[PDB]
Amino acid sequence: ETLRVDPTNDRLSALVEIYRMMRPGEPPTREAAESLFENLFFSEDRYDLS
Amino acid sequence: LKAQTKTEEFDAIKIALASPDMIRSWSFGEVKKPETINYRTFKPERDGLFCARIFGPVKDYECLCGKYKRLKHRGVICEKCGVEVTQTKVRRERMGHIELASPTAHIWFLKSLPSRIGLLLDMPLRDIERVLYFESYVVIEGGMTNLERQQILTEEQYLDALEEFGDEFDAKMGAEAIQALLKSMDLEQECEQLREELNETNSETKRKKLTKRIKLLEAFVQSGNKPEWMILTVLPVLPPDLRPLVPLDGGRFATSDLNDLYRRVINRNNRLKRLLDLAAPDIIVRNEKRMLQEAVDALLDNGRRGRAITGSNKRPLKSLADKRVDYSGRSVITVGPYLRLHQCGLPKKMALELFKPFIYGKLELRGLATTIKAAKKMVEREEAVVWDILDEVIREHPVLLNRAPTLHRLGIQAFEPVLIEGKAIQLHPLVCAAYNADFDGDQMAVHVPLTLEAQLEARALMMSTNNILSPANGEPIIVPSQDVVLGLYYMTRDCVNAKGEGMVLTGPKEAERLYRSGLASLHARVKVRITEYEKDANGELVAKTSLKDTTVGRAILWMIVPKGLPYSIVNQALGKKAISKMLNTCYRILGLKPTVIFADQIMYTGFAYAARSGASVGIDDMVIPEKKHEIISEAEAEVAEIQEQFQSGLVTAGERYNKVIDIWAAANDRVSKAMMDNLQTETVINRDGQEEKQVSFNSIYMMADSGARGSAAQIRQLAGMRGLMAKPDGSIIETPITANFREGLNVLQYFISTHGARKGLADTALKTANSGYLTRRLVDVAQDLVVTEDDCGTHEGIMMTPVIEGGDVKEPLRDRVLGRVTAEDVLKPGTADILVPRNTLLHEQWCDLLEENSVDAVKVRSVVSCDTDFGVCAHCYGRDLARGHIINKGEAIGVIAAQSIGEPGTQLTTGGLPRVADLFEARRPKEPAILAEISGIVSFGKETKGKRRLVITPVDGSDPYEEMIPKWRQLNVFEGERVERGDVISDGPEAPHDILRLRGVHAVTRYIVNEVQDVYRLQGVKINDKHIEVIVRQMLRKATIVNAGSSDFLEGEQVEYSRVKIANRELEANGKVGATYSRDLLGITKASLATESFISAASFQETTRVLTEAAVAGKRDELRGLKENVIVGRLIPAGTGYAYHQDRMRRRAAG
């Protein structure tokens, strides 16, 4: 049912929607969505649980 | 006579939109430069945010350049740099301006959700903004071609439409467009069309919005405002002194953020001028215009948008849209029991510093000082004479005392200063109740009544002795507190056998003489001859004497009791309640002065005999029941019995839980009523015989019984076990605390106790804020309500009967009718006999006469039914005050009502304080009961979809009324029986709106008062019905018109205004065109929203919206209310100033 409420289709589309959610009002970019999403919870710099 | 021009004492105030020229009127120069000061010689740069030429000299009577420095040259405008030499204070006055290159929207009017430009133009917000930022074109006066007037276009669309029609078609974009729109708009024509269109098509949706808009339009027209002024041409600049650049230590400066903002506005505007003269391409000048709009918007109200930040500081700069009192002091307080009720100990140094000007004045008045300077030097030296001078200035000059949590008016009381050596303020013990002031380090503040009127106001109103009674209820607030009542209790009391038991004495004199010599015990059964008086003769004291069977102590105490009081009052055991009723009766009999001095003597003797009594508290004074351990054992049998039952499955889990909890809960009561009996009567002593037993002389019992301090619950917690405790979850543990405080509490018991402690602390700390908030809403809903007329002369009132709840008399009739005026003459069981004629204030004697006869009910005039418009007549209100006399003309009763309702609110815990809140707020309950809409036989119609419709059948009338009642809710009404209007068609709580509409005004006014009084009386709190009745009066203030002939159909309007207009319309005018209405219940917070004065509303409501909404209407605030006059800083239109405001109000609107 969650998938049924999902407006996206592929990886890139989801990344665009996420980037647009985080930083709205401004045009998305492939490198920007990838950079952002990878820099959120997957970066050794911007993320630590210790 | 020529009216006036120059400054007089002004009336009212007006607010409206500003014209460009009107703005230029205030402005004494245009600020053309962002510069402030020269950076070396800190003098202001000419024509800049800080300027001497435009605004004012930097120093008093001194030109900038320094040409004319003399106090002689004044109206001179200097030739070098034009500056009129005048006080520097006019740099705090004179305004300025800026001429904007391009028009700019005023952000308050643009976005303040009545977007005013928008709903004036009937144009949506997003279109207006899309135009303002040059994101699209908008047509203006499109003529007869292809297009609507308010229609918006785009680039291509505009180009095309322009190619098709060169002229007779017009469009612009940006601020200029909105301005042209507004300017072109003709209100008259629009009105003329709206009226016709209103008249033609019949639909709710259509003519509702239609009539609303035409009303708005004609309002705007009568306002005098013109639409263009919503768009800024000239931008006024605030005087420099109100946004200071003033220096500091270390050479550093500090300044308001308005300078940063104004600087931004000026810079961008100038850059726009240049870009206009340089003929920049549109892409640039548009951006500059948008930046200017942003700058101005941020300058006015920075709340909206993106909130520009100040230089080098993250914090957003505070925009334009974004009391300490002299002659005062404070300190820690002490007792000073030696004080009379009318005075307070004032520290020497404090009184010296406070009255300093008075001391100077007196010192050079008698000639002890050459001049004021010499006086200063004298008191600064503290020469020995000045003290005596101080004693002169202190004598008849009262001071004001105040505590921190001020609730009821008694929170501030005036006393007479008595010089004290020390730094602490001595406060009379009997007042400690009114202040809610303990001696654990609470601090109090002092104020000095400077003006003569302030001294006399302090003495005749705010004085301690002038207020002996709670404004909430007639009961004395000067009631002795603790030590004193234990004194009179230990004094007035008897044991079975003592010294001088049974002997006889001539009078109290030799009774005390017998006691003080150690011959006779203070408490001993003795017959003595006393002379008691009575004023029962007409205005005259009758004397009588007899042999009374009393105690030595009571006889001694009788020496204090004044005149006409019976001996019977001191012949009891003298508890706190009896010691209160003593003072009360003394007041309602002998008058004020005797009550005062009596109260004093009572305190002194109380403390004295309490001191002599040698009353203490030891560890052996708290007696644990001998049978405690046994009760514990037995209940502990019960718990394992039920445990064994759960083990055998005879009982369920929840059932077991409830059973065990019940048996422990009973055990608690058992032990309690063991220790209570044991601590009560256990003293067994002998008089001439074997034995006998009486009330114990044990200390802690005396304390708890007398009412000094402690209570059966707390004593229970000391001796018997304490309660069962509950987790934060609120589930109650089935293993109660069997140990008490006298015994040791083991680790667990204490730890489980801790939660209760902290939830206690936290909850109390919260209910403080709740009570305060409630008081605030309450004073906001009442306030301006003040006794205005004297007697309205209405027969109308409410029927007063005793409450008679369940069993006998949860509250008597005498209390409810006391101090209240009769609506109409009531009768004996037999008639043609008028006991209480018509309207007469029912005082003690009268109520007693009603009590003599069997009278079961009295009709009483109330504030809710009073015919007086815009206030209450004294005749209807009642009596209660600090004085037993009827309420004065001009006393502000709304304030004291709210105060009296909110002050006890700390002691309140559906139920509780939030229940009171819900009541006053008129809120519909969660699962309400629905009353019968109309009388007559009813039936259940249709079937199940969301509701099962109930169809009513009135006997004579039609049956258009069918109410759809959801059927999943169990009904009550009999489908085969008739039901009167306002019957129960279901159970559950009932919305007060329903009670008002279906049942009546008096019905709902009774519902509120009875419900809130249930809440308070359940907690043991005395609040007279009066106050709540005034709050109710305020609640029902509005109404909604039904018929017509004068005003509009659905308009919510004042019952005062309405009734005034129909009572005026019943005669003259149309023979009677008078319109019907329907009274409406408004919650207190909603009724508070309605106020005529905008200055008042701008206070507690949301300021921006209020100021705007008033400004567009050109609303004229006539003052007339409390709050607004407080803000504007003039005499309150009530109390002492009531005469002033009266006189003036009459001089105004007249010859």
């Binding site: - | 005087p239 109100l242 200071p244 406070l354 502000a892 004291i896």
Partner: protein, 99 residues
């Protein structure tokens, strides 16, 4: 603490302790209600006008206090005047009518 006449704030003229000589006690809204409940207007006016916010009223009073004349010539509190200027600084025209 005690104060008769001390220093004053620049922005709005109100009693402010600068010397460790303390500023006056704050008279709050609830206190204003207390004075309102009593019939004392003059005590309140002098409280929030002459004793505090009126730059003229304070000195004009002091001279009377030392002269042996207890009166007040209140005038308009500086706070409301500042508010007049602040409101009027916007596109809002606020006027004082009649006579």
């Amino acid at each position: 603490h005690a104060r008769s006449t001390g220093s004053y704030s620049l922005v709005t003229q109100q009693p402010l302790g600068g010397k460790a000589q303390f500023g006056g006690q704050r008279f709050g809204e609830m206190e204003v209600w207390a004075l309102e409940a009593y019939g004392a207007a003059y005590t309140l006016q002098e409280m929030l006008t002459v004793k505090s916010d009126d730059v003229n009223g304070r000195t004009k009073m002091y001279k009377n206090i030392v002269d042996g004349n207890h009166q007040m010539e209140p005038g308009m509190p500086e706070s409301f005047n500042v508010l007049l200027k602040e409101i009027r600084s916007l596109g809002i025209n606020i006027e004082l009518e009649d006579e």
